[PDB]
Design a protein around this ligand. Structure first.
Ligand SMILES: [Ca+2]
Length: 240
């Protein structure tokens, strides 16, 4: 997250850290959202590679023991059938991970609330992006969870020539673009929490940013629109 600030300890209890094994060590690669005690929602491009993954819930400081973490393996990876690694702009950047065990819910670990199918947010709706991603373009990962106020940019405006043009589709959500705040590498797969009816719900899965950089004016962070995949999500969790 570029231009963010440290989040209150465990104030976004559904946020998870997706890590892979590198030799004998583990490294953070993406964010995610705990939607069930044994199911995680993240980005498809986060699990394209065949690596050993693990999920960490109740996390805050990646390099220190906060006394609230729970580590669990990933036993199954279900990527959306239409996902294309060579065309992220085609959408469908979403995947569900079945955990090897059910985590224990508490003050620091809670399920994320999903919106009702087809829900579209009005322009400039209040939302927050969270993650341990890069704090600067080509910079380094954050040690502690970061958050940044990132209001939405409606489709009509985001898909205009003065912004993303045709690169953005209706199955995505755009937020930010003030040239100061945004998502960045490492935030991918993470949530975009938006305030709706007095409650925070996960309306987006961080998908991509500009090649020119993370925080670029008129180039909002692009998110997979969760409300367009509710039936798919339900069908997967009801079968496996
Ligand atoms: Ca920690």
């Amino acid at each position: 997250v570029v231009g963010g600030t440290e989040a209150q300890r465990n104030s976004w209890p559904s946020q998870i850290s997706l890590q892979y094994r590198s030799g004998s060590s583990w490294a953070h690669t993406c964010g995610g959202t705990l939607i069930r005690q044994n199911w995680v929602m993240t980005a498809a491009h986060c699990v394209d590679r065949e690596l050993t993954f693990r999920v960490v819930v109740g996390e805050h400081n990646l390099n220190q023991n906060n006394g609230t973490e729970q580590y669990v393996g990933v036993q199954k990876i279900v990527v959306h059938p239409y996902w294309n690694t060579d065309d992220v702009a085609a959408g469908y950047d979403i995947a569900l991970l079945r955990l090897a065990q059910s985590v224990t819910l508490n003050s620091y670990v809670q399920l994320g609330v999903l919106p009702r199918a087809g829900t579209i947010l009005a322009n400039n709706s209040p939302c927050y992006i969270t993650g341990w991603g890069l704090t600067r373009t080509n910079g380094q990962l954050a040690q502690t969870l970061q958050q940044a106020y990132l209001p939405t940019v409606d489709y009509a405006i985001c898909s205009s020539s003065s912004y993303w043009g045709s690169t953005v589709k209706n199955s995505m959500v755009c937020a930010g673009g003030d040239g100061v705040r945004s998502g960045c590498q490492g935030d991918s797969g993470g949530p975009l929490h938006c305030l709706v009816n007095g409650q925070y719900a996960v309306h987006g899965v961080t998908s991509f940013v500009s090649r020119l950089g993370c925080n670029v004016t008129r180039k909002p962070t692009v998110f997979t629109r969760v409300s367009a995949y509710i039936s798919w999500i339900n069908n997967v969790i009801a079968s496996n």
